[PDB]
């Protein structure tokens, strides 16, 4: 996260840190708890991931230093990537992780509500991007979960900012015209959380951008409301 501040413990209890174990253990991506055995994240996070056996999901974490060999985690039973996904820049950048065991909800780990189909017309004015990503283009993963308040940008304005790309309605953009606050390397897969009528909604999945926090380059997020039926298809099967 560029231009953000340290989160307080329990502030974003749906936020997870997804780690890879191969060749050595390191943070891979962010993700969001959406159900008691379900993490919603970005499909591009799994580039080169040949098996869910190398993945570890840690919830209720503020600081990466809380993670040691004796730290409890959730194993991943299945990686479900949208089957229209080709690359982040072309959309469908969405994936589900089916966990091997269930998350016991509490004040440190609980789900974020998905947006409602009726909320496609609502204007969100209180949106935040979170993660342990870089604070600048060439940096390192942060110990403390960072947060940054970012305004949503219309599809029309986002398309003007990304000449040469096709910004679809399955994408949602967020950023200041002058830049300065955005997601960066290591934040992808994490949430864009918007508070509406005192309830937090998972509006976006951190996906891609041209650099980080540049003037007139908003962050591009998977527009979660456009995938509610896909999520229910995969999580409510049989």
């Amino acid at each position: 996260i560029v231009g953000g501040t340290a989160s307080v413990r329990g502030e974003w209890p749906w936020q997870v840190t997804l780690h890879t174990t191969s060749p050595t253990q390191r943070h891979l991506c962010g993700g969001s708890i959406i159900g008691n055995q379900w993490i919603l994240t970005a499909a591009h996070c799994f580039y080169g991931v040949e098996s869910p056996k190398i993945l570890r999901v840690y919830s209720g974490i503020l600081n990466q230093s809380e993670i040691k060999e004796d730290t409890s985690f959730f194993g991943v039973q299945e990686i479900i990537i949208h089957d229209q996904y080709k690359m982040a820049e072309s959309g469908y950048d969405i994936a589900l992780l089916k966990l091997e065991t269930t998350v016991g909800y509490g004040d440190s780990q609980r789900p974020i509500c998905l947006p409602s189909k009726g909320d496609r017309n609502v204007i969100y004015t209180d949106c935040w991007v979170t993660g342990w990503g870089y604070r600048k283009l060439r940096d390192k993963i942060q110990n403390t979960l960072q947060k940054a308040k970012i305004p949503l940008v219309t599809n029309e304005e986002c398309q003007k900012r990304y000449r040469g790309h096709k910004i679809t309605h399955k994408m949602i953009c967020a950023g200041y015209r002058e830049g300065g606050k955005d997601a960066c390397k290591g934040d992808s897969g994490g949430p864009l959380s918007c508070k509406h009528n005192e309830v937090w909604h998972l509006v976006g999945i951190t996906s891609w951008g041209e650099g980080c926090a540049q003037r007139e380059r908003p962050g591009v997020y998977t527009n979660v409301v456009e995938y509610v039926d896909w999520i229910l298809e995969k999580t409510q099967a049989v």
Partner: peptide, 7 residues
């Protein structure tokens, strides 16, 4: 939480 995800 209008949208419901079954356990």
């Amino acid at each position: 939480c209008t949208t419901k995800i079954k356990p």
